[PDB]
Each structure stands twice: as structure tokens, then as C-alpha cells.
From TrEMBL, chain A:
It comes from Mammalian orthoreovirus 3. This is Mu-2 protein. It is found in: Host cytoplasm, Host cytoskeleton; Virion. The chain holds residues 590 to 734 of 736 of the full protein.
Automatic annotation (TrEMBL), chain B:
The keyword Nucleotidyltransferase applies. One of its GO terms (cellular component) is viral nucleocapsid. Its EC number is 2.7.7.48. Residues 553-782 form the RdRp catalytic domain. This is RNA-directed RNA polymerase. One of its GO terms (molecular function) is RNA-directed RNA polymerase activity. GO terms for biological process: viral genome replication. Gene3D superfamilies: RNA-directed RNA polymerase lambda-3. The keyword Nucleotide-binding applies. It comes from Mammalian orthoreovirus 3. Belongs to the reoviridae RNA-directed RNA polymerase family. It holds the Pfam family RdRP_5. It is found in: Virion.
């Protein structure tokens, strides 16, 4: 009952987006910060969907929820610049209805790219 | 002498020396308000002391370290305190408050915090957050006080300086010491002098509705207000209850060592069991005599009806056979450096061996001398301390013993060696014969229970509406309505049209935290639930109410403990530590849901409940095969409750004291606030004690002694439990007291029962008894005085407080709390006068005028203040047992009315119209000059009136009322019955009542009750102010119609009643010949000996007598229609407003006519009520046996009653009882002197009063 959720939908997304480009099928949603001290973003969830879904998931009120984000200074061992950011939500939690029943998302993930900033999120376009 | 100069006349206006006029009472109020804090402490420095009050005080209280090392930050960004001495060490320290303040603008040496700390805290500076947490929690700890403490001290001064007090019973002055002997006053002013120092101000803080301000001396500690509160508490309770000076020195030593500690409130929590353990729990080692009560818990073992067999002399075999108290008490005294106080208590407790008034008085003193603060801490610390606990289930049910599941729930095999089979069987049979009765299937009962969880501080409506927003439904917001967002009625209103399968997801939202504070206990945290999960939690509390009323039927007061502590009988006090952290799904709720699923399963086949339809699941319960069987509505609700209690609970946390710390987390504790809370806890206590006594006892012992005991000790005869507390009744045999060693073997076996499957029985075998925190020794009640503190008020929120017209009502509550316990009445009543006049004047700030709002004394005399000496009468003339209203007003006015008339012709106010009540003397000039009428009518003005007043849009309120009525309905047959009754009413019953209580004013009444939390400020308060002003300037004609109807009745007293109980028995502590008046009333009248929940439930004429709309109005209106003519169909229409089914409603309306009702019934006709002070006494005795008509002179033809309308007899009994008892002395029998008009004209006047509402 868990593992079919883990594996089975991405076979159908493979069937549907076997040919479209990543520059129209990829998407990303997460927490945002407006300026540089010591343009800025926290990658929360990754969604891949067809364009006839993303163009309606563009304008939905993602910028509704609030978390308390924490920024430190150490490198990741991975090759881009990523600091192991921290974040605690001071509101509600994001409903899974809001994404779709027509698209699938990565279930669990670890977010990456100072002091506490306490800002809100938005949608990252493609 | 300073207060003597301003209170030349007033201090003996209220000490029984000169006559109490009104003008000196208002002069006193002028001098009360026009007054300041430097005057407070120079009055305090004025008095000397007499070398028994003085004690050395260590300077180590004051110089204190900083709070920087005391708090830290959670990994999830939460401020949390670092512990030092155990995990209980989480509170406010008394340290470093001087440097967190900015001095006030128009003040010099006081002020509040600097704000830039809170700017940095809202920016996220860590030390700034720690600083604002510490400042606001010290603000909260100082917030816990009702009034300025200085005015309490000044009320002590103006009361106390009148001196010795004559007693009309004992013909002596009192022998209590005066001002010059109290350690609290001298030590209090010593603390204030040293903390203020040579600085020009003196008061270390000022109380204010906007918030407390601190004095800036560098030696100031933060926990000085609870120390000052304990000082003023013991300062009152000496001179108002007759404590000895020595134990007060002990108690203030405890308080000073508490303020000298690391943190104050932690030491207070850990210290709270010194006064009981060394005095109460070690008392009567080897007596020689005394007199104990003889009771009998009668043959119906749920009656709570007691026949008092009389006094019984004691003997030396009734010594304390309870085990020792040396070890743990001396270890507690050694542990906190307090060996001296424990050594003194264990010295003097040994010195008493006679069960008389002196020993029980000393125990009362020991109970009073403990502290009375309110334990205040950060809310996050609570919900991360007590909601992080799991029970210790050492023997769980093995996984082989459950069947294949049915839906979500596995079922117990019945060949299971585990204990929970018996629990399964009890809840199984109880659910079966619960669903067997058709009384659960009344749709009016459905409407009652749906209305039942509209109570109990409903919250989380925000989280309801955004979870409901998340599950994608359209939503009426109802724009432009005042309170509604913070209401549970809106929670019900949003789901008045919705299908159950579309709302079953929405029972998964989180839960708000409502906080309270307690006396000497950790701050409890009530929580509501939203309305769909309170709705789906029904059959649980159905079967719980079934257990508590039918099956084990234990309880839901006072002579319960009198029977339990009676010497041949023996009691065992059994609690649990932290009940709600034990009921989890691991061992209980699985078995509970399985048994409530299967017990109904025979009777439930296709029955639907309201709201919920049927369904189907499968089962592995027939493990060779697998099938799917349909599911009825009971089982549907249980199937929905299963995942909620199996899952765990989510709790939102938001405080006002730490800056933005919001979080939710999982917690497996059953909620403290629910409909199914206390009844389920009682049912679980009863069932576990039953399983104990049935199987687990003889399975785990050796000797015949304890098993031969517990065979005869079943739960139907010996056990009572209400939530936390339980209680053994050990029957004394023919040999007297049961041997103790068997009982200690038994109780260590109960402790084993607790530790082995997730309980912890706090077992206390002590030879005494507690029950609902009420202490009983040898059949004598102990009034605990800690749990009614005068000064403290629980304010767990920093929300701003309601202004002046209700603090006076809490002063009235302080007065009644002092009434219900055994306090020295000469010195309690006069101090109550002092407080009462101290909170009279107000000094408003209204526009263009400096207004003074003045109550006369007469509003308070209407509210039950006993007058001392009025119109030149004798001092201390009547008691405080007056019914607080027109009844008691009538009683004491008619005791002294001819002496009144002689005082009337003095300073001659004469007009030749011979009144029937005062004769040649008038009343209208003088009683307005004395403003008797002004205060008398001001007393009925409504206090703290908040109103909607804004003229909200009517269409949105109308659709709100319609949605509310849709919530009120589940069956339109209810609507058919009540609309049919409305038709019958508009035919017949309308008109002559001017106000029918109905069931469709109930949406209007729910709206009116929901609109009483707007806390709006300006306009209606100004309207109340001008209402008081135009009530004050208005000159009045005569009294109330009730009172004028009463003033034709006279009476005649003679032959004081024979005694009820023996006076040589200590009935309650604090009452004796020395406390002459209330003790002598207790001896003459006799104690109640009933639970009075049962007795006053016999009074309510409706059977189930619940509707959600004050059923007293129902029964009173029914009896009003009964006496005012009104053919039977109008009575049925008034009952069809409730609309039972109309057939038995027609039957009840036929019954009500010809049956002669109880005496207490007809009180509600005339809007009479038994006041709160009488239920200690047996009242029904002197109603139906002693106050009477046909006096000993004989018949008079004015002492006659017509054959119709014999409802007057009850009211004559009430008024005669009031006149017989309000005076001091023995409750003499009272006989009817004539009524001046005849019963026809008199009852005709009552008819004319009831022509209106």
C-alpha cells in the first residue's frame, strides 16, 4: 500500500512525458528570500507534469503559507553551492489536494540553498 | 492614630458601638479613595509591635544572579528553561528584574520594560527573546492578584483598629491579640522598607489593569509579589479566624525560605505536604476519650440518605493504628533545610489526645497556615512536560490473543489469560443493554445530546474552518458579525447542511490549549474539540453514563466523609497521578472500541443514527475464510472513532508570553475537556477496582486474612470514585477496627496493580479521609482555607481585565467563601464591611464632568450583608444566614419594625395616614434621605453590561439563525410537534403569561449568549454609567411588589427547638461556643446529611430535566400557568413548546393540576430560591415540621387560606423560615400572626403580580 505509491505513478508519468522536454515539464516549489547578506530560495518539493497542468498550477496561491527559515554557513559535498538550511513552519501544512490528481511529486526530500529570516514561499516558473 | 483621625465615627459605626448611618459610610468611602501608597506605609510604620511578631530575615533573598544561564533555545527554535534540580524545576526565579525596565514618563521611580528589546525579539535576537519571556512571565506572576494589595491591608487596618468585640452570646469581649503581634504585618512593612530604602516612593509595585510596574531599587527580586500576597493572606487569616501567632510564624518562615530559594514556585510545589503530613497524618496517637458521630450508609447503596444515630463515646482501642510517619516526613524536613518546623509540628501534635474542639481547631490552624499562591509557568513548558508522558504497561496483551480485525479493530479472544477480558465483558454487556433501551431513541434526546456539547469553552474554530477550506467545500463566512469567529456556535453553524462522508475527514484537525491555574498544583490545561469529533464521540459517553447511573452507579458529599472517617470504620484515599496520560489506545481504547462495537452488534443490524449512514467492511475474524458484513451506524461512529484514538492527537500551541513560538505535535493523552471525560474516567476506576476484587486479589496472595477481607469488600458496597479520587469503605466489624497489617499488605498489592499495566495509585492510608479535597477526621470536617485565597485570581492569559463593576462581586464571593468555613464572625463581618466600603467609589473620567459612582450600603444589604446595629438596636443583632434578596430583606426588616417605628418618630417624620406596616410614621421622606431605596433598587441593576448594539445586517443574521435551526433539527417530527404546539399556544395559552419559554427562542437565545464576549469598551459602559446616575437621582415611591406583598405578613416566635445533635461533639472545625452563632445554628438546625444533588434533582419536575434553556424557567412557567386558571390545552401547549411527543406531554400537563407539589416547587413560582449558605444545614426538617400555620393562640379568620390556591402554604413556610433563622440564637419555631388582608386578598395581590412576567 505504500510501495505502489512510491513506484507505480512514475511509470505513468514516464508513459506521458516520454518525449516532452524538461524545459516545459519540470517544476519546483519552495521557500523564498529576497536579498543577499553575507534571488535566494529553498527547494522544498519537485514536481514533473505536462504543460497543460503546469500552466494552471502557475497562478495558484502558493504564496499563502509561512515558515521560519534558518541559514548557516557550511558547504555541501555536492558540486553546486548549497548550504544545509533549516526551516520550521509557523503556520499550517500544505495539502496534497492542491497539487493535482493529474501529476505526481517527490514524496520526501532534503532542502538546501547568516541567521534566521522568516519569509514565505511562492511558485518557481518554467 | 491617623486612620483614627479620618475614621472617628466610622470605625465604631461597624463595631457595634454607634448606629450605622449612611453618611459616615460614604465619608469613609471618600477617605478610602482620596488616598495613596505612601499613606499606606506610613500608617504601617505608625504601629508598634510587641516582641512576639519579630523574627530575623536573611539578606540572601535580595542579591541574586542573572537569568542568562536559566533559559536556552530548542533545536526547533523554542525558548526553554534549563533545569537545575529535577525536571520539576521550571518556573520564574526571583532574580535580575532591575535592568529590564524603562522608567515611566510621568512617574519618577516606576515603569515598564524598554521596547527595543522587543524590537530585537521580533527581529529574532536570542537574548532579547529570553529577556521578554522573563519580563512577561514576571508580569503574569504579578498579574494573579484581584485588586491593589494595599487596599486589602488598609481594610485590615480600618477593621482592626476598632479593638475588642463584645459577643451577645458569651457576654464577653474577645481575647484575640491586636495589631502588635502579627509577623505578617511587621515583616511585610520590613520588606517594603528595605526594598524601597531611602528612595522617596515606598510601594515596591503598583497593580494596574494595563499592567504592573516595578520599583527600581537594585535589590529588587522578581518573585516579591507572591511573597507579599502570602504575607497579606496570613495577615488576614490570623485576625479573621483566630490562628495562634506561633503557627503563623511557622508559615511565614516557610514563605521567607521560599522567597530565599532558587525559584519560589518550585519550592512551593515541593513543600505543599508539610502541614498535612506532620499534623493531620500523625494525629491522635493515643487518645482516651471524645465523642464521635454514629452514621449509617443505608441499605440502598446509592441513596446518599443518612440517618444520624447520635453521639458515641470513644475508647483507647481507637488509637491510630495507621503506620508510621517518622521516616518520610523527617526526610522531607531534612531535604529542604526545614528540620526545625517539622520538629515543632511533630512535637506539638503528640501533645493532644482528646477529640474536642481544641484539637480539631489546631488541625484547622495547621491547614490554614500553608501558602496560597498560583503556580504560573510558560505554556510551552506545560505542554512539553505533562503531554510527553506514556504509561508503563508492563504486562500488555499478547498479540496472539486478538482475532482477525473487523475494519480497524481486532476483537479479544475470550480464552485470554489477560485481565482485559473482564473489561471487554463489562463494556460489551453495557453497550448491549444500553442499545436495548428505547430511551436512547428519543429524537428529543438526540436534540438534547446534540445541544449538550454546546458548552465547555469551545475553540479551534479557526482550524476547523481552514481544514474545511482544505477539504474543498463552499463556505458561509457571515460577514459583519461581532463575536462569532471565536464561537463554537459558528462551528456548528458551518456544518448544518453537510453530508457525513464529506465531513469525516474534518475530524482530524488540531486542538486549542485553554489554560487555568490552581492552588498549590500544576496549571491544568483544558482543551476543547471541534463539533464533528465531539459529535462522533457519542456512544462512548452513552455507555459511560450507563455505567455511572445503572451498572456500577458509584457517584456523579460532606457526610460521606463523616461516615468514612468515623472511627470503627476505616478509609483509604486512592488517587492516580496524571489520569489523562494513562488512557491510551495501547491497552484501553482498543478494548473499549472492540466491546462497544460488539455489544451493540447483536441489537444493531440496520439501525441508522442521526447524521451517519451505514457502510460495510471485511473481516479476518473467521480466519479460515474472509467475508464482508454490513456496518450499522453505531459501529460506523465507532469505526470513525477508532482511527482517531488509535492515531493520536495534534495540539496547536500558541502563547502570549514567549514571542512567536507556535508548533503542533503528537500527544497520546485523552483530552481533559470533553463530554466523555469524567464519566469515562469514573467508569474505568470502577471497572478496574471490580477486576481487582473479582480475580486479581486471590490470584496473588497467600494468607486467608487479606483474601477473607476482600471477599466481603465489593465495589457495590465499599467503593466510590470520581475521576482522580477513589475511596475505600472498610466496615468496622464486631471487634472494632480492622487489623492494620492486612490493610498494608492489601495496599502494597494495589500499588503492584498500578505498576503492572499502566497506572499509578497514589495510595494514602492515614486513619483520616479526603474526598474532592475535603478532609474528615473522626467524623469532623476540616475547612481547608488554602484553596479559597482572598487575594489571588487565576489569570492565565494576559488579556486585559474587565473594569470596576464586578471586582465588588468577587468581594461578595470572598465573603461567601468566608461564610462556608468556620471563621470568627465578629471579626469576619466587620472586615467584610471594610472591604465592601473600600470598593465603593470609582472616580470616573467621563467627559466634561468628574463623576463619582457611589453605592449605598443597601445594595450590599440586599446581597446578604448582615447589619450590625441599625436604628439604635442591639449590636450584632442578626446573622449572615439571610437569603440574599427580598426574603432576607423582609426577614430582618420585620424582626425590628416596631423599634424601627420608634426610631422613625425620633427625629419626627410623621404623617397622619395610619399605614398597616408602620402606622403613624411615614416612609417616603426618610428612606430617601437615608437612600434606602437608592441602594435597594441599584442592587437589581445588571452589572458589567456588554451589548452588541451595532445594528448588524439582518439578512446575514437571519440566514445564520436558519442555519442554527437546521443544526437544531435532525427530524422534522420535532418541528411538527412544536409547530402544532405553537398553534395550540396561539389559540389558548398566549396572552396571559407575556413570556412563553419556547424552543424557537432558543436559536435567538443561542445568538444572544454568543454575543456576550465582544468585550466592547466605550458606549454601553457610558450607558451603564448614566443608567446608574439616573437611577441615583430618581426619587422612589415604595418597595418592590414582592416585598410590599410580604409586609402584610407577621409572625410570632416562642419555644426554641429541641436540640438536633449533641453539642459536645465537634461537628466541623472552627465552630464551637467561641464561634457562637454559626455553631449554635448548626446544633439547633442540624446538618443536611444528604448529597443534595439527589434532593434538588427530586425538585425538578421534568424527569430528565435537561434542555439547554434553564429548565427552572420551564417548571416555574408551568406552575404559573397552573395557578392562573388556564385550561389543560394551554398547559399542553406550554409543554409542547418542548414537545415531548404530545401524548405523554398531555399526560404530564394533566398530572400537574391535581397533584400537590413539594414546598420547594412553589419557590420558583414567586422566583424564590434557597440561598447557598443553607445546604450545610438540614432545611427540609424545619420547613415541613416547625414553621407552621394555625398558631398556638388558635385560629383567627385572618390566618385563613381559601380552599383553592393552597400554593401559598409553601411561601408562608419559606418566609417563616427566613424570619426564624436570620436572627442570632437558636432556630426557634415560628407561628403565624395575622396577615392583615386575608388569604384571598393577599393571593389576589400575588395574582396581580404574576399578571406580568
Amino acid at each position: 500500500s505504500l510501495l505502489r505509491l512510491l513506484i507505480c505513478p512514475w511509470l505513468h508519468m514516464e508513459k506521458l512525458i516520454g518525449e516532452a522536454d524538461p524545459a516545459s515539464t519540470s517544476a519546483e516549489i519552495g521557500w523564498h528570500v529576497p536579498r543577499e547578506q553575507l534571488d535566494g530560495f529553498i527547494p522544498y518539493v519537485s514536481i514533473r507534469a505536462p504543460r497543460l497542468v503546469i500552466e494552471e498550477l502557475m497562478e495558484k496561491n502558493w504564496g499563502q503559507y509561512h515558515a521560519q527559515v534558518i541559514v548557516t554557513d557550511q558547504l555541501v559535498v555536492g558540486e553546486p553551492r548549497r548550504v544545509s538550511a533549516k526551516a520550521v513552519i509557523k503556520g499550517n501544512h500544505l495539502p496534497v489536494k492542491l497539487i493535482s490528481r493529474f501529476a505526481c511529486f517527490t514524496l520526501t526530500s532534503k532542502y538546501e540553498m547568516g541567521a534566521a529570516y522568516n519569509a514565505r514561499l511562492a511558485f518557481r516558473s518554467d | 492614630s491617623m486612620i483614627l483621625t479620618q475614621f472617628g465615627p466610622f470605625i465604631e459605626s461597624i463595631s457595634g458601638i454607634t448606629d450605622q448611618s449612611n453618611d459616615v459610610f460614604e465619608n469613609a468611602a471618600k477617605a478610602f479613595s482620596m488616598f495613596t501608597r505612601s499613606d499606606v506605609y506610613k500608617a504601617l510604620d505608625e504601629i508598634p509591635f510587641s516582641e512576639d511578631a519579630m523574627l530575623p530575615i536573611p539578606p540572601t533573598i535580595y542579591t541574586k544572579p542573572s537569568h542568562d544561564s536559566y533559559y536556552y533555545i530548542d533545536a526547533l527554535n523554542r525558548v526553554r528553561r534549563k533545569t537545575y534540580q529535577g525536571p520539576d524545576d521550571v518556573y520564574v526565579p526571583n532574580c535580575s528584574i532591575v535592568e529590564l525596565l524603562e522608567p515611566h514618563e510621568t512617574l519618577t521611580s516606576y515603569g515598564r520594560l524598554s521596547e527595543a528589546i522587543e524590537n530585537r525579539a521580533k527581529d529574532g535576537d536570542s537574548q532579547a527573546r529570553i529577556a521578554t519571556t522573563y519580563g512577561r512571565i514576571a508580569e503574569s506572576q504579578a498579574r494573579q492578584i484581584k485588586a491593589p494589595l494595599e487596599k486589602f491591608v488598609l481594610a485590615l487596618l480600618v477593621a482592626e483598629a476598632g479593638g475588642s468585640l463584645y459577643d451577645p452570646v458569651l457576654q464577653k469581649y474577645d481575647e484575640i491579640p491586636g495589631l502588635s503581634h502579627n509577623c505578617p504585618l511587621w515583616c511585610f512593612r520590613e520588606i517594603c522598607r528595605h526594598i524601597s530604602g531611602p528612595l522617596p516612593d515606598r510601594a515596591p509595585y503598583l497593580y494596574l489593569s494595563a499592567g504592573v510596574f516595578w520599583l527600581m531599587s537594585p535589590r529588587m527580586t522578581s518573585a516579591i509579589p507572591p511573597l507579599l500576597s502570602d504575607l497579606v493572606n496570613l495577615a488576614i487569616l490570623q485576625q479573621t479566624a483566630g490562628l495562634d501567632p506561633s503557627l503563623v510564624r511557622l508559615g511565614v518562615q516557610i514563605c521567607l525560605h521560599a522567597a530565599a530559594s532558587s525559584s519560589y514556585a518550585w519550592f512551593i510545589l515541593k513543600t505543599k505536604s508539610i502541614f498535612p503530613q506532620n499534623t493531620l497524618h500523625s494525629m491522635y496517637e493515643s487518645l482516651e476519650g471524645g465523642y464521635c458521630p454514629n452514621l449509617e450508609w443505608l441499605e440502598p447503596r446509592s441513596d446518599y440518605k443518612f440517618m444520624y444515630m447520635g453521639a458515641m463515646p470513644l475508647s483507647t482501642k481507637y488509637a491510630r493504628s495507621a503506620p508510621s510517619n517518622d521516616k518520610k516526613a523527617r526526610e522531607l524536613g531534612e531535604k529542604y533545610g526545614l528540620s526545625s518546623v517539622v520538629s515543632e509540628l511533630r512535637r506539638r501534635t503528640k501533645t493532644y489526645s482528646k477529640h474536642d474542639f481544641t484539637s480539631v481547631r489546631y488541625i484547622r490552624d495547621a491547614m490554614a497556615c500553608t501558602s496560597g499562591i498560583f503556580l504560573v509557568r510558560t505554556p510551552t513548558e506545560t505542554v512539553l512536560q505533562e503531554y510527553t508522558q506514556s504509561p508503563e504497561i508492563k504486562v500488555p496483551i499478547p498479540q496472539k490473543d486478538w482475532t482477525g480485525p473487523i475494519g480497524e479493530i481486532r476483537i479479544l479472544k475470550d480464552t485470554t489469560s489477560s485481565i482485559a477480558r473482564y473489561l471487554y465483558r463489562t463494556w460489551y454487556l453495557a453497550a448491549a443493554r444500553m442499545a436495548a433501551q428505547p430511551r436512547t431513541w428519543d429524537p428529543l434526546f438526540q436534540a438534547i445530546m446534540r445541544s449538550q456539547y454546546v458548552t465547555a469553552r469551545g475553540g479551534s474554530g479557526a482550524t476547523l474552518r481552514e481544514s474545511l477550506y482544505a477539504i474543498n467545500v463552499s463556505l458561509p463566512d457571515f460577514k459583519g458579525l461581532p463575536v462569532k469567529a471565536a464561537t463554537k456556535i459558528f462551528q456548528a453553524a458551518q456544518l448544518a447542511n453537510l453530508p457525513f462522508s464529506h465531513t469525516s475527514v474534518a475530524i482530524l484537525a488540531d486542538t486549542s490549549m485553554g489554560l487555568r491555574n490552581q492552588v498549590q498544583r500544576r496549571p491544568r490545561s483544558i482543551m476543547p474539540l471541534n463539533v464533528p469529533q465531539q459529535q462522533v464521540s457519542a456512544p462512548h459517553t452513552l455507555t459511560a453514563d450507563y455505567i455511572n447511573y445503572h451498572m456500577n452507579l458509584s457517584t456523579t458529599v460532606i457526610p460521606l466523609g463523616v461516615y468514612a472517617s468515623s472511627p470503627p470504620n476505616q478509609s483509604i484515599n486512592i488517587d492516580i497521578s496524571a489520569c489523562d496520560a494513562s488512557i491510551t489506545w495501547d491497552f484501553f481504547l482498543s478494548v473499549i472500541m472492540a466491546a462497544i462495537h460488539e455489544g451493540v452488534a447483536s441489537s444493531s443490524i440496520g439501525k441508522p443514527f442521526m447524521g451517519v449512514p451505514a457502510s460495510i467492511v471485511n473481516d479476518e475474524s473467521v480466519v479460515g475464510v474472509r467475508a464482508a458484513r454490513p456496518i450499522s451506524g453505531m459501529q460506523n461512529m465507532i469505526q470513525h472513532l477508532s482511527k482517531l484514538y488509535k492515531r493520536g492527537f495534534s495540539y496547536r500551541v500558541n502563547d502570549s508570553f514567549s514571542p512567536g513560538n507556535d508548533f503542533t505535535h503528537m500527544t497520546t493523552t485523552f483530552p481533559s475537556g470533553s463530554t466523555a471525560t469524567s464519566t469515562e474516567h469514573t467508569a474505568n476506576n470502577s471497572t478496574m477496582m471490580e477486576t481487582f476484587l473479582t480475580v486479581w486479589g486471590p490470584e496473588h496472595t497467600d494468607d486467608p486474612d487479606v483474601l477473607r477481607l476482600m471477599k466481603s469488600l465489593t465495589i457495590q458496597r465499599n467503593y466510590v470514585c470520581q475521576g482522580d479520587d477513589g475511596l475505600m469503605i472498610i466496615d468496622g466489624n464486631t471487634a472494632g477496627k480492622v487489623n492494620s497489617e492486612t490493610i498494608q499488605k492489601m495496599l502494597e498489592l494495589i500499588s503492584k496493580y498500578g505498576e503492572e499495566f499502566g497506572w499509578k495509585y497514589d495510595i494514602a492510608y492515614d486513619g483520616t479521609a479526603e474526598y474532592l479535597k475535603l478532609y474528615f477526621i473522626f467524623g469532623c470536617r476540616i475547612p481547608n482555607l488554602s484553596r479559597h485565597p482572598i487575594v489571588g485570581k487565576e489569570r492565565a492569559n494576559s488579556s486585559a481585565e474587565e473594569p470596576w463593576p464586578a471586582i465588588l462581586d468577587q468581594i461578595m464571593g470572598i465573603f461567601f467563601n468566608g461564610v462556608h468555613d468556620g471563621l470568627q464572625w465578629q471579626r469576619w463581618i466587620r472586615y467584610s464591611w471594610a472591604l465592601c466600603c473600600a470598593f465603593s467609589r470609582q472616580r470616573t473620567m467621563t467627559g466634561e464632568s468628574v463623576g463619582y459612582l457611589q453605592y449605598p450600603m443597601w445594595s450590599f444589604v440586599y446581597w446578604g450583608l448582615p447589619l450590625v446595629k441599625v436604628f439604635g438596636s442591639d449590636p450584632w443583632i442578626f446573622s449572615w444566614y439571610m437569603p440574599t434578596g427580598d426574603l432576607g430583606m423582609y426577614s430582618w426588616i420585620s424582626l425590628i419594625r416596631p423599634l424601627m417605628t420608634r426610631w422613625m418618630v425620633a427625629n419626627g417624620y410623621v404623617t397622619d395616614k395610619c399605614s398597616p406596616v408602620f402606622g403613624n410614621a411615614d416612609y417616603r421622606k426618610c428612606f430617601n434621605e437615608l437612600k434606602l431605596y437608592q441602594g435597594y433598587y441599584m442592587a437589581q441593576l445588571p452589572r458589567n453590561p456588554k451589548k452588541s448594539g451595532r445594528a448588524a445586517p439582518r439578512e446575514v443574521r437571519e440566514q445564520f439563525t436558519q442555519a442554527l435551526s437546521d443544526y437544531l433539527m435532525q427530524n422534522p417530527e420535532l418541528k411538527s410537534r412544536v409547530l402544532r404546539g405553537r398553534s395550540e399556544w396561539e389559540k389558548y395559552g398566549a396572552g396571559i403569561i407575556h413570556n412563553p419559554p419556547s424552543l424557537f427562542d432558543v436559536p435567538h437565545k443561542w445568538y444572544q449568549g454568543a454575543q456576550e464576549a465582544a468585550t466592547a469598551t466605550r458606549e454601553e459602559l457610558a450607558e451603564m454609567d448614566e443608567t446608574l446616575m439616573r437611577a441615583r437621582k430618581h426619587s422612589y415611591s415604595s418597595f418592590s411588589k414582592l416585598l410590599e406583598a410580604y409586609l402584610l405578613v407577621k409572625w410570632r416566635m416562642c419555644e426554641a427547638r429541641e436540640p438536633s445533635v449533641d453539642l459536645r461533639l465537634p461537628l466541623c472545625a472552627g465552630i464551637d461556643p467561641l464561634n457562637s452563632d454559626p455553631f449554635l445554628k448548626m446544633v439547633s438546625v442540624g446538618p443536611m446529611l444528604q448529597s443534595t444533588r439527589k434532593y434538588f434533582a427530586q425538585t425538578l419536575f421534568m424527569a430528565k430535566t435537561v434542555s439547554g434553556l434553564d429548565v427552572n424557567a420551564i417548571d416555574s412557567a408551568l406552575l404559573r400557568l397552573r395557578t392562573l386558571g388556564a385550561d389543560k390545552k394551554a398547559l399542553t401547549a406550554q409543554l409542547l413548546m418542548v414537545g415531548l411527543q404530545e401524548s405523554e406531554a398531555d399526560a404530564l400537563a394533566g398530572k400537574i393540576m391535581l397533584q400537590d407539589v413539594n414546598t420547594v416547587q412553589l419557590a420558583r413560582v414567586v422566583n424564590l430560591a434557597v440561598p447557598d449558605t443553607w445546604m450545610s444545614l438540614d432545611f427540609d426538617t424545619m420547613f415541613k415540621h416547625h414553621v407552621k400555620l394555625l398558631p398556638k393562640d388558635g385560629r383567627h379568620l385572618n390566618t385563613d387560606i381559601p380552599p383553592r390556591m393552597g400554593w401559598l402554604r409553601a411561601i408562608l413556610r419559606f418566609l417563616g423560615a427566613g424570619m426564624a433563622m436570620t436572627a442570632t440564637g437558636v432556630a426557634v419555631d415560628i407561628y403565624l400572626e395575622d396577615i392583615h388582608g386575608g388569604g384571598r386578598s393577599l393571593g389576589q395581590r400575588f395574582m396581580t403580580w404574576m399578571r406580568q412576567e
